[PDB]
Motif scaffolding. Structure first.
Motif, PDB file in Angstrom:
ATOM      1  N   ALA A  37       0.824  -1.201   0.000  1.00 58.21           N
ATOM      2  CA  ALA A  37       0.000   0.000   0.000  1.00 58.21           C
ATOM      3  C   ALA A  37       0.863   1.257   0.000  1.00 58.21           C
ATOM      4  O   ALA A  37       0.363   2.363  -0.204  1.00 58.21           O
ATOM      5  CB  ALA A  37      -0.936  -0.001   1.200  1.00 58.21           C
ATOM      6  N   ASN A  38       2.159   1.080   0.232  1.00 50.95           N
ATOM      7  CA  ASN A  38       3.091   2.202   0.260  1.00 50.95           C
ATOM      8  C   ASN A  38       3.938   2.238  -1.008  1.00 50.95           C
ATOM      9  O   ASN A  38       3.781   3.125  -1.847  1.00 50.95           O
ATOM     10  CB  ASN A  38       3.996   2.108   1.490  1.00 50.95           C
ATOM     11  CG  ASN A  38       4.589   3.450   1.875  1.00 50.95           C
ATOM     12  OD1 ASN A  38       4.254   4.014   2.916  1.00 50.95           O
ATOM     13  ND2 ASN A  38       5.474   3.969   1.033  1.00 50.95           N
ATOM     14  N   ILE A  39       4.836   1.266  -1.140  1.00 50.31           N
ATOM     15  CA  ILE A  39       5.707   1.186  -2.306  1.00 50.31           C
ATOM     16  C   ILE A  39       5.571  -0.165  -3.001  1.00 50.31           C
ATOM     17  O   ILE A  39       5.049  -0.253  -4.113  1.00 50.31           O
ATOM     18  CB  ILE A  39       7.183   1.408  -1.923  1.00 50.31           C
ATOM     19  CG1 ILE A  39       7.392   1.131  -0.434  1.00 50.31           C
ATOM     20  CG2 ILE A  39       7.611   2.826  -2.270  1.00 50.31           C
ATOM     21  CD1 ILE A  39       8.834   0.856  -0.066  1.00 50.31           C
ATOM     22  N   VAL A  40       6.044  -1.215  -2.338  1.00 56.14           N
ATOM     23  CA  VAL A  40       5.973  -2.563  -2.890  1.00 56.14           C
ATOM     24  C   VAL A  40       5.384  -3.540  -1.880  1.00 56.14           C
ATOM     25  O   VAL A  40       5.236  -3.217  -0.702  1.00 56.14           O
ATOM     26  CB  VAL A  40       7.363  -3.065  -3.325  1.00 56.14           C
ATOM     27  CG1 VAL A  40       7.234  -4.095  -4.437  1.00 56.14           C
ATOM     28  CG2 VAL A  40       8.236  -1.900  -3.765  1.00 56.14           C
ATOM     29  N   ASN A  41       5.052  -4.739  -2.348  1.00 59.73           N
ATOM     30  CA  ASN A  41       4.479  -5.766  -1.484  1.00 59.73           C
ATOM     31  C   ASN A  41       5.573  -6.511  -0.728  1.00 59.73           C
ATOM     32  O   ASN A  41       5.447  -7.703  -0.447  1.00 59.73           O
ATOM     33  CB  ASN A  41       3.651  -6.752  -2.311  1.00 59.73           C
ATOM     34  CG  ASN A  41       4.395  -7.247  -3.537  1.00 59.73           C
ATOM     35  OD1 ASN A  41       5.404  -7.942  -3.425  1.00 59.73           O
ATOM     36  ND2 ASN A  41       3.897  -6.889  -4.714  1.00 59.73           N
ATOM     37  N   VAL A  42       6.648  -5.801  -0.399  1.00 55.11           N
ATOM     38  CA  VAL A  42       7.763  -6.394   0.328  1.00 55.11           C
ATOM     39  C   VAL A  42       7.884  -5.805   1.728  1.00 55.11           C
ATOM     40  O   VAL A  42       7.673  -4.609   1.929  1.00 55.11           O
ATOM     41  CB  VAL A  42       9.094  -6.188  -0.421  1.00 55.11           C
ATOM     42  CG1 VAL A  42       9.321  -4.711  -0.709  1.00 55.11           C
ATOM     43  CG2 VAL A  42      10.251  -6.766   0.380  1.00 55.11           C
TER      44      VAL A  42
END
Length: 58
Positions: A37-42
């Motif tokens: 939800a911010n940058i990546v699903n990491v």
């Protein structure tokens, strides 16, 4: 048996642990999804240690 819950518990608990062992990490796949939800699903749990002590203090 006449009430032997050790043979059924010791046998199940064994197969249970192994299940939770891998089944656990799986739940992680969801966590990382939150960061998506911010940058990546990491994401990870290392930086989450900050809460480890917090919850303990409470």
């Amino acid at each position: 048996e006449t009430g032997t819950l050790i043979v059924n518990s010791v046998l199940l608990f064994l197969a249970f642990v192994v299940f939770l062992l891998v089944t656990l990490a799986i739940l992680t796949a969801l966590r990382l999804a939150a960061y998506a939800a911010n940058i990546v699903n990491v994401s990870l749990v290392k930086p989450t240690v900050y809460v480890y002590s917090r919850v303990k203090n409470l």
